[PDB]
Design a protein around this ligand. Structure first.
Ligand SMILES: C#CCNC[C@H]1O[C@@H](n2cnc3c(N)ncnc32)[C@H](O)[C@@H]1O
Length: 340
């Protein structure tokens, strides 16, 4: 069996001529020739079975992506693994080959306003479908937005996704760890478990800001620093917004801070389209109840050239609503059976 800059890709006779793309903590991504469909594809090797949390992330990714079907969400074309649980040590997820991702692209490329608009439209179109399935992505960031050579955008990595649960969203101060730090909404550090759809809209707002300047807007240097950066730009929350935080430790932390003025978006981004900045402000709104929702964002004047609700589909069957790793391996084996 073929081996790439590390170890073997047991991707059988169907996929050949492998080429390394990138790596991970328990996986490697290669491109490969699909001898059946006569096109090169991406293949992600995943080896998660020794750790319960790895099994959790892998099962979520597989289960969600197999149920979703949307132009702005990466699909799973094939899954390769051993014919028996006993022999299954790795799982290979086969996907359309994408040229780059938004993280790699922003490292060297300035985006025209037309590309910012197009990318943002596609992100929100995909997000509308995800949210319509009652699912939260919970880790939206540039590296989880794939792009092919014609700038078709596909959301990927649902390993941290959850079913929305707003009735159980409240928690205490400085406990929660949702999303990647730079894309984490202020309430995560204050009183939220990240179980409502507003968590994803905040991340999209951070991504829009980053598209406007090729720098993260809130580059917290560690978990505690992140709120400093958010409040340094948004300014002090209003009395009404504080009155919405019943938790006393969270509210009193904010009350302990000196008054900070808002930094205007047009001083941070003087070349940006004014409609883009208006939408940015509504996504990066401190109060998660006042934060714009995905269908409102699609209808915003900035996106008027693309907005078409009849071409912004929703999921047929939403998701309506602990396990040892051995049960999780069983479920992964069951979930991947359709490809044998
Ligand atoms: C997480 C993680 C590791 N990703 C490593 C590399 O895989 C790349 N990747 C993941 N899926 C695809 C993909 N479907 N096509 C091309 N590259 C992909 C991603 O851009 C990154 O360079």
């Amino acid at each position: 069996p073929e081996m790439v800059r590390g170890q073997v890709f047991d991707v059988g006779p169907r996929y050949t001529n492998l080429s390394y793309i990138g790596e991970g903590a328990y996986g490697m991504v290669c491109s490969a020739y699909d001898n059946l469909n006569k096109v090169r594809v991406a293949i992600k090797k995943i080896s998660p079975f020794e750790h319960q949390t790895y099994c959790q992330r892998t099962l979520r990714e597989i289960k969600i992506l197999l149920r979703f079907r949307h132009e702005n969400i990466i699909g799973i074309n094939d899954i390769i693994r051993a014919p028996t649980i006993e022999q299954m040590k790795d799982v290979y997820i086969v996907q359309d080959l994408m040229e780059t991702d938004l993280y790699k692209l922003l490292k060297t490329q300035h985006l025209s306003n037309d590309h910012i608009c197009y990318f943002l439209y596609q992100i929100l179109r995909g997000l509308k479908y995800i949210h319509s399935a009652n699912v939260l992505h919970r880790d939206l960031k540039p590296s989880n937005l794939l792009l092919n050579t014609t700038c078709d955008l596909k959301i990927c990595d649902f390993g941290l996704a959850r079913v929305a649960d707003p009735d159980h969203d409240h928690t205490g101060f400085l406990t929660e760890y949702v999303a990647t730090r730079w894309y984490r909404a202020p309430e995560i550090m204050l009183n939220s478990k990240g179980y409502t759809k507003s968590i994803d809209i905040w991340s999209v707002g951070c991504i829009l800001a980053e598209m406007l300047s090729n720098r993260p807007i809130f580059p917290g240097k560690h978990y505690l620093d992140q709120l400093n950066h958010i409040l340094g730009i948004l300014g002090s929350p209003s009395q009404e917004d504080l009155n919405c935080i019943i938790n006393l430790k969270a509210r009193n932390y904010l009350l302990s801070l000196p008054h900070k003025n808002k930094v205007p978006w047009n001083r941070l981004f003087p070349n940006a389209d004014s409609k883009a900045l208006d939408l940015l402000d509504k996504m990066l709104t401190f109060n998660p109840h006042k934060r714009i929702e995905v269908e409102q964002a699609l209808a915003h004047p900035y996106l008027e050239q693309y907005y078409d609700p009849s071409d912004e589909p929703i999921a047929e069957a939403p998701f309506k609503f602990d396990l040892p790793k051995e049960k999780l391996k069983e479920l992964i084996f069951e979930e991947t059976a359709r490809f044998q």
